[PDB]
Curated annotation (Swiss-Prot), chains A, B, C:
Annotated SUPFAM superfamilies: lambda repressor-like DNA-binding domains (SSF47413)
InterPro entries: Cro-like (IPR000655), Cro/C1-type_HTH (IPR001387), Lambda_DNA-bd_dom_sf (IPR010982)
Domain HTH cro/C1-type residues, every copy: 8-61
UniProt entry keywords in alphabetical sequence: DNA-binding, Early protein, Repressor, Transcription, Transcription regulation
UniProt function note: Cro represses genes normally expressed in early phage development and is necessary for the late stage of lytic growth. It does this by binding to the OL and OR operators regions normally used by the repressor protein for lysogenic maintenance.
Natural source organism: Enterobacteria phage 434
Biological process, per Gene Ontology: regulation of DNA-templated transcription
Source species taxonomy: Viruses, Duplodnaviria, Heunggongvirae, Uroviricota, Caudoviricetes
Name of this chain's protein: Regulatory protein cro
DNA-binding region(s) in UniProt: 19-38
Keyword Lipid metabolism: no
Superkingdom: Viruses
Pfam family, one: HTH_3
Keyword Lipid biosynthesis: no
């Protein structure tokens, strides 16, 4: 859970959401989530919005603190 | 999408929400949303809460940046 | 509504949520909410996440401003 992709996947799943629901609520492409969760995108463009949908601190999501 | 009313309507709709659902989730009057979306209220009282429900940055919502 | 437990209960209910739904969306234990709402826990560990789920300002939730 020390990687961003790991952190987002774990939190998404803790909130009982699908990648699709995450995507809808954050207003980004579902292909954007997969890439983040699959560890491709290290620096997400809409991290803020993603974090808002996951009810967590963006800083925490990006850096793990 | 350069006006606040435009910005809120577009984001609301991107998130597949109705004015009623926006209102419930933000905890404000549904007549408050219509006024904002109809461009009457330029400076919304609960912008923060509205932005939280739309999973976006309040600053972005108010000014467009 | 001048106490945190009062403030959280009132807002939770304004948003038409159950303690269980609050808990799921915030990603904390449902026993964590009851304790806060029952006034036992004065300084909640996940106040931020709780506030995110209630679409409100954490500061407002904790202090009432």
């Amino acid at each position: 859970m020390q990687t961003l992709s790991e952190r987002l996947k774990k939190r998404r799943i803790a909130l009982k959401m699908t990648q699709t629901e995450l995507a809808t609520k954050a207003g980004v492409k579902q292909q954007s989530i997969q890439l983040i969760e699959a560890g491709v995108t290290k620096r997400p463009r809409f991290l803020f919005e993603i974090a808002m949908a996951l009810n967590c601190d963006p800083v925490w999501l990006q850096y793990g603190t």
